[PDB]
Each structure stands twice: as structure tokens, then as C-alpha cells.
Amino acid sequence: PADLSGTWTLLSSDNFEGYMLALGIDFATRKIAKLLKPQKVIEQNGDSFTIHTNSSLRNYFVKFKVGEEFDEDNRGLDNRKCKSLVIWDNDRLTCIQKGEKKNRGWTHWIEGDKLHLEMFCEGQVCKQTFQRA
Structure with missing residues (x-):
């Protein structure tokens, strides 16, 4: 494990297009999503996390405990239900989002x-990095 807490400003983003294409996000939405640079806010208390991804268009968050499965309806993204699980892979916090799409998840x-963040689906990996700000 590692302390990921903080308020984080997006500093680099690679292949967000491919990740969104893998999810079927429509053309107009991909355009808007790329111009945004949402802030990441991580609240971490033991095994309990709340991760916020906040933009002017929509502040959203996911709340979970490490090792505790939870459904995600994904209403703000592709509207596909996944059963998600977050565990530690050494010091990498890794989420497996089980559902229709193959090899869907993320790692911080x-x-x-x-x-650092990787978001991945269907072999498309978006790599992002952030600075504490």
C-alpha cells in the first residue's frame, strides 16, 4: 500500500481517445472530455477510499473499500453496469471492472x-499523471 491521498491536477494524458473509443463514447462527448482536465481528489482512510473526478460539467466520485466488491452503473460514462473490485498489487491500487467489456479497469x-493513473479497456490504455495542487 501507499498514501495516494490529495488534491491532484492533471499534468499529462496519453491515449484518452483510445480508452473512450473502447467504451463507445460518442464523438461529441469525446471532444468535450479531452478539453477538460478534471481534478482528482483522493480521500484515503485505511481500506476506505473516496475518489473524486471533478470537472465543471460534472463532479463525480466512487467510494469503496479495498477487497469489497461493488457495482457501478457508469451513468456518467458508458452506462454499462460493472461489478468492481479494488485491491493492492504491491503499492499499486488496482481496480478490475467486471462486465461486458474485456480487461476493463484502472490502476493508481x-x-x-x-x-499516476492508467485507465484501460479492451487493450486500450490511457496513461495520466498528476501533480499535487
């Missing part, structure tokens, strides 16, 4: 004080 980790 921290390098020094720089937050």
Missing part, C-alpha cells in the same frame, strides 16, 4: 509525490 500509484 505514486512515484515520489507524483500520482
